[PDB]
Amino acid sequence: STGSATTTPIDSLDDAYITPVQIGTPAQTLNLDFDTGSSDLWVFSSETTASEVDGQTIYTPSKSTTAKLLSGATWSISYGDGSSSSGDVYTDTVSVGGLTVTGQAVESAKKVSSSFTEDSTIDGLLGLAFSTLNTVSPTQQKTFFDNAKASLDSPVFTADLGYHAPGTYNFGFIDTTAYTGSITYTAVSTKQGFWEWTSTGYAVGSGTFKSTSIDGIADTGTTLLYLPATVVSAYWAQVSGAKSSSSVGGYVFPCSATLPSFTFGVGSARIVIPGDYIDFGPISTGSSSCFGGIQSSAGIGINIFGDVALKAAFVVFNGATTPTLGFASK
C-alpha cells in the first residue's frame, strides 16, 4: 500500500503545516500537524475541556462505530516550546491520503495548553518519530507509520514541504518526479527516539563551506532552524543591524534587509536554504524589526533541522531495519 496527502501552511509565515486525516467510521476529518519530532497522535475531541477549544474540529469517538476505549490508558506530553496536552486513549481506524491503519491509538485530549487553544487551525498532532517516545501509559503505543510499515510497498515516508505553498507527505514510495538530482542518504541514530543525524557543515551566502559535524534532528513539527551559537552568529553577522534580543527571544534583523542564503551539508551534498525562507516577518504588527528563521539551539540541548531547513529539500524518512535519512534538492 501507499498513501499521499497534501500538507498546507497554517498561515502566511509557514509557522506550521496541516494535513487532513480521516479518523473513525464514518470518517471524521481533522487537520493534524505531522510531527517527525514526537510520537503521539492526539486530537482535540468531545472530551476536551470546553474552555480550551476555540475553533478546532473535534473527534467524537461516540459517533464512530469503530472506536474502542483503550481501557486504563492515559497520555501526557510536554513539548520543547513549553506547550502540553493530556488525556485518555481510543483505538480507531485512521487513514492518511488513502492509506489506512486499523487499531491506531488515537489520543483524545482532555486538556491542552493555551498555545494549542489559540491555534484554531491545528486539530491535533500526528507523531512520526520513533515509537519509543510515545507517552501512552501503562502500555506504550505505536505511531501511525510504525503500524502502517509492514503493509507499505517500501518502509518509508517522505516530507516535501512548500515555501509559502502546499506540499506533500507520501507513505510507502519515493516520488522520483518530486526532486532534482539524486537523493543523498545519511545515518540516523534512534538512541534519543528522533530522526537524529549529523550534517557535514554549512555555508553562509556565497561564503566558503565550513566542514564541521552538526548533530541534529529532522523535525517537521518545529518551525525554525536551531543550530549552535557559533554557526548562528556567523550567519547573522552577515546581515547589517541583526542582533540577538533577549526581550524578543532570539535574533532579529531590520525588515529592510536582504537575507543571505544558508547551506547545510548532507554527506558530500549541499542543501541551500534561500534567504527569503529565513524571514519570519515583523516581531509585532507594523514593526520594522523582523524575526529570524535561524536561531541558536543553546539551551535546547539538541540542534533542530525544522521546517526552515526541511522545506528546502525533498526528505526521505527511511524506516528500514537500519533507519536512514535522505535529502535531495528540488
Swiss-Prot record:
It catalyses: Hydrolysis of proteins with specificity similar to that of pepsin A, prefers hydrophobic residues at P1 and P1', but does not cleave 14-Ala-|-Leu-15 in the B chain of insulin or Z-Glu-Tyr. Clots milk. Disulfide bonds join 255-290. GO terms for molecular function: aspartic-type endopeptidase activity. GO terms for biological process: proteolysis. It comes from Cryphonectria parasitica. Belongs to the peptidase A1 family. This is Endothiapepsin. The active site is at 35, 199. Its EC number is 3.4.23.22. The gene is EAPA. The lineage of its organism: Eukaryota, Fungi, Dikarya, Ascomycota, Pezizomycotina. Keywords: Aspartyl protease, Disulfide bond, Hydrolase, Protease, Signal, Zymogen. Residues 17-328 form the Peptidase A1 domain.
